[PDB]
Write a protein that binds this DNA or RNA. Structure first.
Ligand SMILES: Nc1ccn([C@H]2C[C@H](O)[C@@H](COP(=O)(O)NP(=O)(O)OP(=O)(O)O)O2)c(=O)n1
Ligand SMILES: [Mg+2]
Ligand SMILES: [Mg+2]
Length: 428
DNA sequence: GGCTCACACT
DNA sequence: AGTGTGAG
């Protein structure tokens, strides 16, 4: 309960969608490159950006036309379009390539299309018994940064010189004859993550970064400290200095309104300033669960488990119809429900063959023009047959009384979003 | 900005 | 069963 019981890693692919396209098209490699969807509006919306393009200021959610003003040589790859919508199939398949490799090492929790947490606690005990008392060379950690090192009293004017000196200070001081030390466990964790990152790159051509620490939140934070193509070890001891200047919003789950209340109500900026408040005081402001979570977390302690889940629990297809393009006829709503239902059907049949399960509930969601909320409305029905016409007709049946227009041909208010989601999966 | 996913709350 | 937050 100093939050040092587990070794947890978070592995995240570098500029993932870009790398998928660069692997396929060698002309894009080692260049300023972005991935875009819907090429016809302002050149497309950027969804992923190479490190070479980031150095010109190009970011996610820029329009390509705009990104081209910062980087005129920027190269683009377009997301596949099918039935009038962006289709992410090539990136989900590439994801499967990566997840299957990691799952050879340990139990993973698929956290996104491009990252997974790894509980390495057992793999570490077993690796610590294999090298009996035998030390750990820097050569086993060729890409690892030890966060908060080097410290104290040429080389270190270069990034690779600092990395090494810190690693050397860390290793020089490790107590290897003691198999229970949390720091030693982390070190062996990092060795394993080197091997995992090497296998990923060898087997896929994709580079990634990772964090190694005692829990998910720290592992995720660590990962991003030395992107791209590097891994970062955040020990329990590094936490006070690390947290002392770490904006609250950088910690996973605190990037939104909760994080903002924490800052506003308590009158603080940094994760470390949370240590001054009693658990009861945090619970008073933020509730029993969040207050307890904050109190532990600001001291580097979190217990959320790496869940044994490699598969998504829901399979969704959605499309926005912004501004003037909002859907305004019954016929038009039906046609799009059908396009969504067809893609979903293909994805479900594949899921059923691959993963030996079937979805049993269909969720329909919409947004009406005028609504401020991402969803105006969710309704659900039975999913008894992977049949796109049935699924489309059922989703229409379920929403059609949201229609204010008595003309019945027309649809009001116009719809700015449709979403179909298969959920409540059972084995078969 | 657009297409996804997970989960807490009621 | 339905809504809202947070992430990637
Ligand atoms: N808002 C977002 C964030 C991510 N994505 C997709 C595209 C990203 O390549 C992929 C993984 O997201 P990410 O890990 O947050 N960023 P990415 O892998 O591109 O770069 P780094 O992790 O190297 O920064 O999810 C998206 O489509 N919309
Ligand atoms: Mg990534
Ligand atoms: Mg990611």
């Amino acid at each position: 309960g100093t939050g040092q019981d587990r070794v947890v890693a978070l592995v995240d692919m570098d500029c993932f969608f870009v790398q998928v396209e660069q692997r396929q098209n060698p002309h894009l490699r080692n260049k300023p490159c972005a991935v875009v969807q819907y090429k016809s509006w302002k050149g497309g919306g950027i969804i992923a950006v190479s490190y070479e393009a980031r150095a010109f200021g190009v970011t996610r959610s820029m329009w390509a036309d705009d990104a081209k003003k910062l980087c005129p040589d920027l190269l683009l790859a377009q997301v596949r379009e099918s039935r009038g919508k962006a289709n992410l199939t090539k990136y989900r398949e590439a994801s499967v390539e990566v997840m299957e490799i990691m799952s050879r090492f340990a139990v993973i929790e698929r956290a996104s299309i491009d990252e997974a947490y790894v509980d390495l606690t057992s793999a570490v005990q077993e690796r610590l018994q294999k090298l009996q008392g035998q030390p750990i060379s820097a050569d086993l950690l060729p890409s690892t940064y030890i966060e908060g090192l080097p410290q104290g009293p040429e080389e270190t004017v270069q990034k690779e010189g600092m990395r090494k000196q810190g690693l050397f200070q860390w290793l020089d001081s490790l107590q290897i004859d003691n198999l229970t030390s949390p720091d030693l466990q982390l070190t062996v964790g990092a060795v394993i993550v080197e091997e995992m990152r090497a296998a990923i790159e060898r087997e896929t051509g994709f580079q990634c970064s990772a964090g190694i620490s005692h829990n998910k939140v720290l592992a995720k934070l660590a990962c991003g400290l030395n992107k791209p193509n590097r891994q970062t070890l955040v020990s329990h001891g590094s936490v006070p200095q690390l947290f002392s200047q770490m904006p609250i919003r950088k910690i996973r789950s605190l990037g939104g309104k909760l994080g903002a209340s924490v800052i506003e109500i308590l009158g603080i900026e940094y994760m470390g300033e949370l240590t001054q408040f009693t658990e009861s005081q945090l619970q008073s402001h933020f509730g029993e669960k969040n207050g307890s979570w904050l109190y532990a977390m600001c001291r580097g302690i979190e217990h959320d488990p790496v869940k044994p889940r490699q598969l998504p629990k829901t399979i969704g297809c959605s499309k926005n119809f912004p501004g003037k393009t909002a859907l305004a006829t019954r016929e038009q709503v039906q046609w799009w429900l059908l396009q969504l239902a067809q893609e979903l059907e293909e994805r479900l049949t594949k899921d059923r063959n691959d993963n030996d399960r079937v979805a049993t509930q269909l969720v329909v969601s919409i947004r009406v023009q005028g609504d401020k909320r991402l969803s105006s409305l969710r309704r659900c029905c039975a999913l008894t047959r992977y049949d796109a016409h049935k699924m489309s007709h059922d989703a229409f049946t379920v929403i059609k009384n949201c229609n204010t227009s008595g003309i019945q041909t027309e649809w009001s208010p116009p719809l700015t979003m449709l979403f179909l989601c298969a959920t409540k999966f059972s084995a078969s």
